Protein: Actin interacting protein 1
Organism: Caenorhabditis elegans
Amino acid sequence: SEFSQTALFPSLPRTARGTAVVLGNTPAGDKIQYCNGTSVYTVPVGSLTDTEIYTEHSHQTTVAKTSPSGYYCASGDVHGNVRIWDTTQTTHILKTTIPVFSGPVKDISWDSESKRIAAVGEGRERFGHVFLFDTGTSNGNLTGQARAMNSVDFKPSRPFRIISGSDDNTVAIFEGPPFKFKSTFGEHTKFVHSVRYNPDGSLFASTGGDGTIVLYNGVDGTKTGVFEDDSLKNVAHSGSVFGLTWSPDGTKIASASADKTIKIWNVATLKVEKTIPVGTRIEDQQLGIIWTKQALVSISANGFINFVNPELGSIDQVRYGHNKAITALSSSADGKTLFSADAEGHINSWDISTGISNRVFPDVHATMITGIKTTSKGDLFTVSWDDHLKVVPAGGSGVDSSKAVANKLSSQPLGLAVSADGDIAVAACYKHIAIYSHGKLTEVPISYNSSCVALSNDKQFVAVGGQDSKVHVYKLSGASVSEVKTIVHPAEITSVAFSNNGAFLVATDQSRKVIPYSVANNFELAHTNSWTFHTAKVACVSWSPDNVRLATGSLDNSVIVWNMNKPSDHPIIIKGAHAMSSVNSVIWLNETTIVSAGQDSNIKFWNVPF
Ligand SMILES: [Mn+2]
């Protein structure tokens, strides 16, 4: 009642170099599914803001597939669990959870009747299991391959069959129900990463590390041919092929390869039809792909989602973002753009009204970014664990990471504050307070270890939170600071912020407390109420433009909105704001709109009325 999520700029799928990514989809093909963290993302092809998230696995999610009926989703994790849950309601009630084997689930396949599920992976006692979705009842045995089963698929037509690809280089076929081994095929010479039946079940194809794509008769697995690219010698791709998928009408196959291309094939002629290069960088390798009734999507090693135009043979849309923990957020002065940074140094720009993303490239840092701030002139200041404070300019395309000023710091930067106009920047470091005013990086040693910093709107005060449980407030004269007040907290300071009108300074700490101070009154307590509603370390704080409300994000997964005009009132608690994830950054876009970002790679927008 007190708030509502109005938009989500979702996490990209989890990816690992040279590792296949498996996608799922809704019956109509209007949404794709992928995993990151302990979550399952159902991402719409026609919306950049309405992705749905299911977060109930306790272990890292691997693959998720929605049944042909569209009513259930079966998702696996690295532990070997396959949870089958309702997709129709936000409560997502669990139907069944089955421990298929001890180890990671790599692929899942629903039969055409939405009655059976075959799950495969790396398991101690077996590599695959087939069973009933609703009861967990075994519906056969998938014994037959000697190493991890990487891909599995049901024949959608009768007689029923199940095919699988394995690290033992073979493709196996099972007949049923009940299902049992029928044959093995050794056309491949390296790991088989993907096996898929066409829509009518008359044929299936396989591919993998040896770069070839084989076509087979759907009922008995007899090879009918191999795909040819006349520019290559006896291979479909010049590198590993991580996945293939069939067009809805079965006349074409699309493949994703380490060779950095997506290729579309003509099934009838067995010849390549379009070759679509994604890029020339190592991150442009394609690790997964799926063709739905509404879109053909391929995934880059960097997690980017590429929407392919099969007619033109090109890439239509690329959705960027993060798959690593987001650590900082900063919006542009005009409120049209949002910048987000992560734990691996990546930064993305987002158009706030549409959700359209852009990955900053080149990369400003190669490691953790502990802060980023925009200036009324379009620059973006940043600090990272590589002990550098960099200033990215505007020239190349929006923010020119093309090339700009890097300054070594004497100690690691933990926090960053910058004046609106960019005239002054202060970085709170492990052993120093670094001040940046037009070229001169002036460093002031401190006796304690800092943890965060805030600069008053009028540039007169610099508040430095410390690991000594004190907020050190300094008056800033040029490139020098003089401590005018030392505020004591019960535990280490975690974040600080000044209201835009300079009326208040707020500090949060590891004891889960949020404490505001009256600036005009020598930083005395602004009120005496106990703002201890978070149940875990508070990670961030930010003031509303109205200088009265503020918000905090915590490791307890929540965002809490506080009201300075009613300190005894219960605050607004957005519980589970980021499910099973710390909320690392929160900022206000206006007096009733908050944006939060989490360890989960998600960026959420919240409408919070008065
Ligand atoms: Mn299938």
Summary: Residues 378 and 398 are 8 Å apart (CA to CA). The chain has two domains: 1-10+323-610, 11-322.
